[PDB]
Amino acid sequence: EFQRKLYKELVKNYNPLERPVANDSQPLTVYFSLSLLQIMDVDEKNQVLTTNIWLQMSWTDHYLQWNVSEYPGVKTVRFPDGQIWKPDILLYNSADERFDATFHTNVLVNSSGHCQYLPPGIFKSSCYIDVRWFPFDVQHCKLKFGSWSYGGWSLDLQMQEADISGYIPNGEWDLVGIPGKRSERFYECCKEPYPDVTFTVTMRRRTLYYGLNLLIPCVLISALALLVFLLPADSGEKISLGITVLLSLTVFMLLVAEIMPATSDSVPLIAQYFASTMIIVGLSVVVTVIVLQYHHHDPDGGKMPKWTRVILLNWCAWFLRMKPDLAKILEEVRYIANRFRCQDESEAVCSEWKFAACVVDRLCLMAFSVFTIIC
Amino acid sequence: EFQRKLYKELVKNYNPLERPVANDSQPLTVYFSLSLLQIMDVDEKNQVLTTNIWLQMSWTDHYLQWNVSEYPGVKTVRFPDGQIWKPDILLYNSADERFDATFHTNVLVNSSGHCQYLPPGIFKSSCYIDVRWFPFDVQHCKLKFGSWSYGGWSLDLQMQEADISGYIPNGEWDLVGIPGKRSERFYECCKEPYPDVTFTVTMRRRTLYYGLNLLIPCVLISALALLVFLLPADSGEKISLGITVLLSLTVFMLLVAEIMPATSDSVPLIAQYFASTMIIVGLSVVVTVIVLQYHHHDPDGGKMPKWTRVILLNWCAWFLRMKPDLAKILEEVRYIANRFRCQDESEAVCSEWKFAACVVDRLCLMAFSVFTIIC
Amino acid sequence: EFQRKLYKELVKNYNPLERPVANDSQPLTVYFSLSLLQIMDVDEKNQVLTTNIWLQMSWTDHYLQWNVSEYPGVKTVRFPDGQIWKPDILLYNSADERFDATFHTNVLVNSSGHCQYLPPGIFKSSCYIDVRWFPFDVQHCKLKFGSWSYGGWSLDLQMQEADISGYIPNGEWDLVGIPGKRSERFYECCKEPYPDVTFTVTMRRRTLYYGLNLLIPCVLISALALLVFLLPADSGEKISLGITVLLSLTVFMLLVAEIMPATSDSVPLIAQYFASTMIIVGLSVVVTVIVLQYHHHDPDGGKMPKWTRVILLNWCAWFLRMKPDLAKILEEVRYIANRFRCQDESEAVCSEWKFAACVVDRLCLMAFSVFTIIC
Amino acid sequence: EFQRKLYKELVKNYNPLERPVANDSQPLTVYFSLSLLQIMDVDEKNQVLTTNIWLQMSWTDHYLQWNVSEYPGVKTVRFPDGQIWKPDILLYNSADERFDATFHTNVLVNSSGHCQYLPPGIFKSSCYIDVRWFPFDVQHCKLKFGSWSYGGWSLDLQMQEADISGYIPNGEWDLVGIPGKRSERFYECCKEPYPDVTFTVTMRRRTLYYGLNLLIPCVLISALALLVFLLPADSGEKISLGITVLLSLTVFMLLVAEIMPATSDSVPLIAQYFASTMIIVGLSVVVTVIVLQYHHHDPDGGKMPKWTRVILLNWCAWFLRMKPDLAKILEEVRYIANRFRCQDESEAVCSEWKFAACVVDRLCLMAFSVFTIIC
Amino acid sequence: EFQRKLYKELVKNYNPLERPVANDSQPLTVYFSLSLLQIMDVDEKNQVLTTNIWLQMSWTDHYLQWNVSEYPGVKTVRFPDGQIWKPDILLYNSADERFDATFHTNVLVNSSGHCQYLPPGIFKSSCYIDVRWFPFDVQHCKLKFGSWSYGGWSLDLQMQEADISGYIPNGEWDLVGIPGKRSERFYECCKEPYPDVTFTVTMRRRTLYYGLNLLIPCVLISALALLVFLLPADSGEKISLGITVLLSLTVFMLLVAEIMPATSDSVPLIAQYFASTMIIVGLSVVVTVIVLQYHHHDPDGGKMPKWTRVILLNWCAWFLRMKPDLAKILEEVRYIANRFRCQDESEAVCSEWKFAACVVDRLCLMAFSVFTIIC
Ligand SMILES: CCCCCCCC/C=C\CCCCCCCC(=O)O[C@@H](COC(=O)CCCCCCCCCCCCCCC)COP(=O)([O-])OCC[N+](C)(C)C
Ligand SMILES: CCCCCCCC/C=C\CCCCCCCC(=O)O[C@@H](COC(=O)CCCCCCCCCCCCCCC)COP(=O)([O-])OCC[N+](C)(C)C
Ligand SMILES: CCCCCCCC/C=C\CCCCCCCC(=O)O[C@@H](COC(=O)CCCCCCCCCCCCCCC)COP(=O)([O-])OCC[N+](C)(C)C
Ligand SMILES: Clc1ccc([C@H]2C[C@@H]3CC[C@H]2N3)cn1
């Protein structure tokens, strides 16, 4: 009875076009805040933050006022989109194909004219995502809100601290905080300044999954590439091991090409580890080729340079703690004996080249080890 | 004739803004339930439950009442969106880009004013999906509904048991149950409390497909990695087998990277099996390198430590139940004979190193076997 | 002139809320059919059938009647959405995020009041897709239509045979038929029953592409895995061949993981062939390891069990149709001669182990062959 | 002043429901054409053509006429959706989830009543895409337009040649032409016939990218598979080369599985080349196994069939232009000498088997070469 | 008070259909510019530029004028969509499924009637993307705006320089500039010309990420393929190395198939490097097969052509700075001695073929090196 009467009286001559101030020369104060409910998604490749947010807007409407003695029990009223003046506050840096993602709900007005408006929405905002320090990276995503067509002379936007009481923690992003800052800006469009409120959502990535999926595979690849230096050359498998470890690395590069977020803005420090490991694997293949040249050296070819015969077989080697008819028959047997004694000599020469390969092989083992550590 | 007359009389002075109570100071009771029809999708990566649901809302409208003797045959009427007051009940934890997924249908009103409203819809809700015990995991997805702008003083939400009579079983998720609980909450926005009804959909994953696609490949990989310990060293293929099994493991890691749902919140126990198998494969490659060092040992290098000559060739070995001119011609032949007798000695020394490799090879076979069992 | 006059007269006092019957106590008959134009997509993973359909609804409207002598030439009229009463017939088992996919068109009404309404639309419906017999699988997808808010007492839904004259054959699904069945159901919501019409679209998959992309690769993999039993052991490549065939199998498992539709409801019989082939490949690798143990057996180790010396070298082998100073010099030469005669003996022992490997190798060839056939 | 007056006079009693003809018994002529601006996408897998098109509709409206002496300067007027009668022309074979993709713009009307209406839109149409001759394939995609609810007695659709002056060439599809044909069809719905205009867009694929990404890899794979026949058997790598070439082929099959469009309707002739190359690779692996059996033949096993000793070592070989105490000491030395003379004989027998392998190896080289050519 | 009065007076007799000019014969000038805020995405495969833009339109409305002495404090007013005449300026080359992506906001009008309208929007435009010089490629994407239904006689479009003060730099595309050009075009539709304003957005790709992900892998592949020429032939692994490097190349071709943008219009010069590297790898495999034929040559087969014995062993080799009873016993020993002396001769012949392989091996090393440089 009284709710009906009030609803009929309130709209008499009301104009949703009119900014509802008593004095036209004065600006209308609008308090703007928001409630952060959940960080739905952080799109690194598209540079888009998705959030579930309840916007909070409050203003006084001069015309929507009533004495609650003449309408007993009617302490508030509600108006849908289009029947009440509302601030046209938009998210400036929206990434939504519709640009305005707010779901339009009721404005709640009490008897002194105070208008409350809390539209929810899944908001997409354009956020510059810096993955230089990925996975230990902190992102500052700005949410810039402001009246689109009401400037500072007409709509005095004011900020209130963002609400996080209802926040639901994300399983990948730790909410550091959501500070806000009201600014008064000028635009080439207009001589009048347009205030805005910007909420910076500071997020801290929880790195566990990434440290478990991206870093241990590099240690296992590097380790399996460094086992080539322990594999004997007689096996005939050093190249198989090293080249197959590199093929596995390439497959893991496909995986990394998917798991790791790339935005092309910088060079994630983490990727200097992927590079260190690809270079250690390729250089262990190059050094396995050098060791194989040493091991398979031709005994009838060149002679081992005295230079290397002392650099490796002596110095490095020590540092590694490594160590008539009767006469006709005589000529026939002597040939055989000397043939034997000559292949034996060639086998000894071969044994030094085979030994040098072992020494070079272990030196590379230790050298490659320390290099991994520092990197 | 009477349907027309009733439809004309009912809207006379009706106001869809008015909460349709007789006494304004009193709250309006709204019974809220839902019918679960189908669980369409459980998005683990986006943390979104998709369901086909029929919402059920019922209230009494004081103005929509008629005597069915003055309108014979007209026992009910129907009103579309915008011509009747309706509760503004939303899904709070919506993940829909539109936020309100309900398809708006007719409100059915009978002659005493009872309003029934069963809007259908494909509802997306944000659900925390815990895959710690995947594939034997149970998910509790909350559906929180409540009036957006009507608080507890105006709209007394009441719950009724959810309907599952029409449910269609999912081929991947067993519906344990959908209990509900009405709560009365406070929000920083407002001093008035806002009741809500929350339906918790408890689902139990049917693990067959996952146990068939993800677990047997790990047993086949582990088994093929443990066949390296039975492959003879003379073959010259132990490294080829082990390293290729690891390459196949990496490809299977791509597959697992797709089939398995990862949400980065925890560490699926199942993944401790993927880790156990990758470690068994890498350690069988390391132990194959050690066996190859033993087998390919240089007979003219070091001597087999008595320590190991007893630890392996004796103890482990037993535990495994393993086992003038004429004189010038004489000198020539003696050299040849002694050369033979010296290579033979070196061949025997080599045979112990080749034997030790076999013993170490089988010990690793049994050791690796028991390790798999416990893990 | 007459079209204008008729359009003005027809809407005078018309109410799109009124079910357009003359007697209010009687139900309104609505004939419902559809024209199937094209089966756009069969989503096995999401369990969604997409179709292009023209719905067909016909009823009589008591008020939309005119004498075509007073409006010469005006034999029909057309009304858009919102200006005429229309049945609210929805697809119950919709999978569309909007839930109602019908494109709203004109209702065509002739002079006796007969209303025709053929809205087109791209309809998504939830269909249980059973791939047990994939690719020779037949799917029965239900399309359940019914009035949402008009029960059997108000709207007497009646069915007419579906139209397929305009159907455009799909390149992957053969339309067996689209039978319909009108049912009268009860729901927990309501004591009144709600009739519905359900069209079951029966589809038969055209299996060519699948038989060409999924089955021949398994025959080629199995064949290349069985060529290991013909490869000699001296080559030193049996393991390379078998393990690389298994790696190729894993890559083909990625392909199958994409081409093959999996819905987790059952276990496609076809997949018992994928399992048979993976098991034949892994068991040919295990049997190649056994053959290699036989071939590389140590002549100074154990002795070939008489048991196997008769089981293989005799029985299986036959079944396969397989087959002073002078004296000092004497001692020196005798040693050499006996050394030769002793390695020769050891070479013969080795030749039986090498022979046994060949016999086991071919037995496995034939055994593995018959196993493939039956599977 | 005059524009305002005309706009007020024109809508007086206007009815957007009225087909705007002077005589009601007569049909209204509507000229229909379109401007093709760009072929946006040809979806082979979903069988959907996407185009940017400007529809062109023209008709005369009897009521929208004015004398341009009483409204000086006002030579045309414009009306938005809903304030003027418009033809309800739809794309019958739409693949758009909304079914009507036209963006609704102004109708331009001049002083004699001629209505022009050029709505733009991104149109999705269902097109049967035949990839039998891919990449040299020509597609005929139909665009069927017609009035949905106005039959031939009410709306006389007429065609005009499609406009391509503004067309922007596609980088993948050459526009052969867009002929049109007006048809008068009957439907089971209705006894009245419904005319339609169908524009067939004929496209010719520009095959460069496909010939560069899909065909050369098959020539390189086939060539690398045929280098196995030139690799010596002593290398011990023929199987490694052939089986790894097949593994690379499988990876390339993944690539082809993505680049190549498959619609399951036919069997792209191009794919007979993919099959020819997979079969040449598998058969070169089979023939490498046969060559290896020849090369590794056991000298103490069977004897080379005279049959093959003449077929290969002679005929094919020629066609390829290929080619007391003292006595005790005597017995000891004679044994050694005869042992030598016996292994030598066995080495010669081995050399024929090794020679035969070379002859078979080259015959397969030439045979496989000619086979590639014809295929 | 005055805002209300003005809003009531301004709409009295206003007609949003009327182009708001004082003289009807004259055209209305509309200034059109835009503010570029962010280049959201450059879709090379779909040929679509996505941008966040604020359109800027300004015109004078003759009717929306008031004296600001009779409405003190009211210096501007605002009108939403549908209550004021607005230019119907569309993006001609839109790629949006809705075709008009502009979010409709208020028109701001001051007291002399000047209308300002700055609708924001996420605009999709069809842009021809030329990747011939990728990654050092510059794209010119046109944005063609114009009145759809107002020709040059009614709406005199005029251009103003685009605004970039608010631009936010993209992490992948450097904004060179956004020049504009107003054109007056004719269309087959209409005899009247339709002016348009086209803004060409010139972008310069920042190539770092691409040079790091696509080019270094080709240098590492080419280098690992050229290490086969340093690997000794005795290792028995040249083919394993080369063929596995090619397999890794194929995997990298999958990666390139994803990272690299292909539009099929041209042939990216960069891809001539991918071709150079695939050809160097395949030709090093072919030359490794030739070297293996040389190394494994049969000493009892043909003789080394004098031609090659001088071309390689001399010329190239030098350029590379590379280098009774008693008598019966005599016959027995002589045989053995001569057998030895004959295998030795055959070993020397083999050593020249093994030497020639080394010379050919290094020549190919240097030849392949210079070829890489030039390419
Ligand atoms: C730490 C190593 C370098 C690392 C950095 C990479 C640098 C380049 C890589 C490897 C370089 C390795 C050194 C060269 C090989 C040694 C050959 C030699 O000693 O003599 C040979 C010279 O043969 C040549 O011409 C060698 C120089 C050509 C190298 C070209 C690089 C190709 C690999 C690219 C791979 C890039 C790496 C991939 C990265 C992921 C022959 O001579 P000799 O017969 O031995 O001499 C005795 C003869 N005498 C008795 C008659 C006197
Ligand atoms: C052109 C070839 C066929 C091509 C078409 C494919 C057909 C099938 C493929 C290959 C067949 C190749 C011919 C058989 C091998 C020769 C063996 C032989 O000669 O004798 C052996 C017989 O051993 C057998 O039992 C051979 C028959 C079994 C073949 C089963 C096919 C498995 C491979 C599936 C791969 C499928 C292909 C993959 C396609 C991508 C043993 O006898 P022997 O000791 O040599 O004889 C002398 C002994 N004597 C002195 C006591 C008398
Ligand atoms: C620079 C090389 C070419 C490069 C371009 C590619 C061209 C083609 C590739 C390679 C060609 C390499 C040359 C041929 C091999 C040498 C054989 C030879 O000398 O004699 C053999 C002839 O055997 C033949 O029939 C050889 C010709 C067939 C080649 C077919 C190409 C297959 C590979 C496709 C791969 C494509 C490449 C892949 C590209 C990524 C046998 O004769 P001989 O016993 O040695 O002679 C002495 C006997 N005598 C004593 C009785 C007199
Ligand atoms: Cl007002 C109203 C809405 C929906 C219904 C339900 C009864 C049948 C089954 C679902 C729906 N149609 C009943 N009444």
C-alpha distance from residue C219 to each of C135, C171, D253, E150 (Å): 17, 26, 16, 68
**CA dist., res. B248 & res. B221, Å (int):** 8
Roughly how many angstroms between the first and final C-alpha of chain B, as a whole number? 80
C-alpha distance from residue D250 to each of B258, C217, D259 (Å): 20, 10, 14
Q: Running DSSP on this structure, what letter comes out for residue A212?
A: I
As a dihedral over the C-alpha atoms of residue D262, residue D265, residue D269, residue D273, rounded to 10 degrees, the angle is 50
Asked if A73 and B25 come within 8 Å (Cβ–Cβ), the reply is yes
Q: Which atom of ligand 3 sits closest to the CA of residue E279?
A: 40
Written as six digits, the tokens of A169 are: 């923690």
**CA dist., res. A7 & res. A12, Å (int):** 9
A187 carries a ligand binding annotation: yes
Residue B250 is nearest to which of A37, A231, A251, comparing CB atoms?
A: A251
A149 carries a ligand binding annotation: yes
Residue A3 is nearest to which of B18, B301, B339, comparing CB atoms?
A: B18
Give the DSSP letter string of E269-333: TTHHHHHHHHHHHHHHHHHHHHHHHHHT--TTS----HHHHHIIIIIIHHHTT---HHHHHHHHH
Residue of D nearest to E283 (CA): D224
Residue B7 is nearest to which of C18, C188, C243, comparing CB atoms?
A: C18
Written as six digits, the tokens of A127 are: 């956020």
Angle at D344 between CA D340 and CA D349, to 5 degrees: 150
Please, are residues A147 and A89 in contact by the beta-carbon 8 Å criterion? yes
Q: Cα distance from C37 to chain D (closest Cα, Å)?
A: 9
Please, are residues E360 and E312 in contact by the beta-carbon 8 Å criterion? yes
Instruction: Determine whether the shortest distance from the Cβ of E176 to ligand 3 is under 6 A.
Output: no
**Residues of chain E contacting residue A93, judged by C-beta atoms under 8 Å apart:** 37-38, 52
Method by which the coordinates were obtained: cryo-EM
Written as six digits, the tokens of D128 are: 């049967």
Q: Which atom of ligand 4 sits closest to the CA of residue B108?
A: 1
Residue of B nearest to A106 (CA): B149
Residues in the ligand 2 pocket, defined by CB under 6 Å: C 220, 223, 226-227, 230, 323; D 279, 282-283, 286, 302
Instruction: Determine whether the shortest distance from the Cβ of E98 to ligand 1 is under 6 A.
Output: no
- CA-based nearest residue to C119, from C18, C201, C33, C19: C33
Please, are residues A228 and A124 in contact by the beta-carbon 8 Å criterion? no
B19 carries a ligand binding annotation: yes
**Residues of chain C contacting residue D101, judged by C-beta atoms under 8 Å apart:** none
Q: Which residue has the tokens 């833009």?
A: E53
Residue B248 is nearest to which of C13, C94, C250, comparing CB atoms?
A: C250
Q: What is the resolution of this structure in A?
A: 2.3
Chains that touch A (3 or more CB pairs under 8 A): B, E
Q: Classify the C-alpha dihedral A347-A353-A355-A361 as positive or negative.
A: negative
- For a substitution probing ligand 1, which of A286, A289, A295, A312 has the most ligand atoms within 8 Å of its CB? A286
- CA-based nearest residue to E218, from E186, E256, E173, E184: E256
Report which secondary-structure segment, H or E, holds B246: helix B238-259
**CA dist., res. C47 & res. C53, Å (int):** 19
Beta-carbon-side half-sphere exposure of residue C282 (alpha carbons within 13 Å): 21
Q: Which fold has domain D2-205?
A: Acetylcholine Binding Protein; Chain: A, (2.70.170)
The beta strand positions in chain B, using DSSP E, are: 28-43, 48-60, 76-79, 89-91, 107-110, 114-117, 120-126, 138-147, 155-159, 173-177, 180-187, 190-205
Written as six digits, the tokens of B273 are: 């099996």
**CA dist., res. D51 & res. D102, Å (int):** 12
**Residues of chain C contacting residue B72, judged by C-beta atoms under 8 Å apart:** 24-25
Q: How many CB atoms lie within 10 A of CB B275?
A: 13
Q: Which residue has the tokens 């004081």?
A: B62
Residue D250 is nearest to which of C163, C251, C333, comparing CB atoms?
A: C251
**Residues of chain A contacting residue B263, judged by C-beta atoms under 8 Å apart:** 171
Q: For chain E, give every domain's residue range.
A: 2-205, 208-374
Instruction: Determine whether the shortest distance from the Cβ of E216 to ligand 1 is under 6 A.
Output: no
| Phi–psi pair at C249, nearest 5 degrees | -60, -45
**Residues of chain B contacting residue C15, judged by C-beta atoms under 8 Å apart:** 4, 7-8
- CA-based nearest residue to A206, from A130, A137, A270, A110: A137
- For a substitution probing ligand 2, which of D286, D289, D308, D364 has the most ligand atoms within 8 Å of its CB? D286
Greatest CA separation found in chain E? 152
Q: Classify the C-alpha dihedral B118-B121-B127-B132 as positive or negative.
A: positive
* For ligand 3, atom 36: residue with the closest CA: D223
* Sequence-separated (6 or more) residues with CB below 8 Å from residue B129: B42, B43, B44, B47, B139, B141, B261, B263
Burial class (CB in 10 A: 0-12, 13-18, 19+), A180: middle
The beta strand positions in C160-264, using DSSP E, are: 173-177, 180-187, 190-205
Q: Cα distance from D99 to chain C (closest Cα, Å)?
A: 6
Which candidate in D329, D342, D346 is best for mutational testing of the C interface (most C CBs within 10 A)?
D329
Report which secondary-structure segment, H or E, holds C248: helix C238-259
**CA dist., res. C230 & res. C288, Å (int):** 11
- CA-based nearest residue to A233, from A180, A184, A177, A295: A295
Written as six digits, the tokens of B200 are: 């918790």
Written as six digits, the tokens of E39 are: 């280049």
Amino acid, single-letter form, for residue A122? I
Which SS3 state, helix, strand or coil, does residue C236 take? coil
**CA dist., res. E255 & res. A262, Å (int):** 14
The beta strand positions in chain D, using DSSP E, are: 28-43, 48-60, 76-79, 89-91, 107-110, 114-117, 120-126, 138-147, 155-159, 173-177, 180-187, 190-205
Asked if E336 and A339 come within 8 Å (Cβ–Cβ), the reply is no
Instruction: Determine whether the shortest distance from the Cβ of C188 to ligand 4 is under 6 A.
Output: no
Chain CA centroid to CA E63, Å: 51
Amino acid, single-letter form, for residue B15? N
**Residues of chain B contacting residue C296, judged by C-beta atoms under 8 Å apart:** 232, 234-235
Q: What is the CA radius of gyration of chain B?
A: 39
Written as six digits, the tokens of B150 are: 């009507």
